[PDB]
Amino acid sequence: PPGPPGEPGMRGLPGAVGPPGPPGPPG
Amino acid sequence: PPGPPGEPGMRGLPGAVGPPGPPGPPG
Amino acid sequence: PPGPPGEPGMRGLPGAVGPPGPPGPP
Hints:
Three copies of one chain form a homotrimer.
Chain A (H helix, E strand, L loop, with lengths): L27
């Protein structure tokens, strides 16, 4: 008889930090 | 016979929110 | 024998864009 299913895969790597925000409002 | 492949892993965790933007344009 | 491990998940979503900067100078 075939063996049991393999272990579930590894969780993926964490996502990249977001881009910096836009410039602020004018002075 | 080796068993069926394991299930795919979970997608990774989302990235952190990005840093704040630069100061706005001068008056 | 146990089957092969599953494939890894893909990379997580990129983070959201950061907040607006501070108001500009006088």
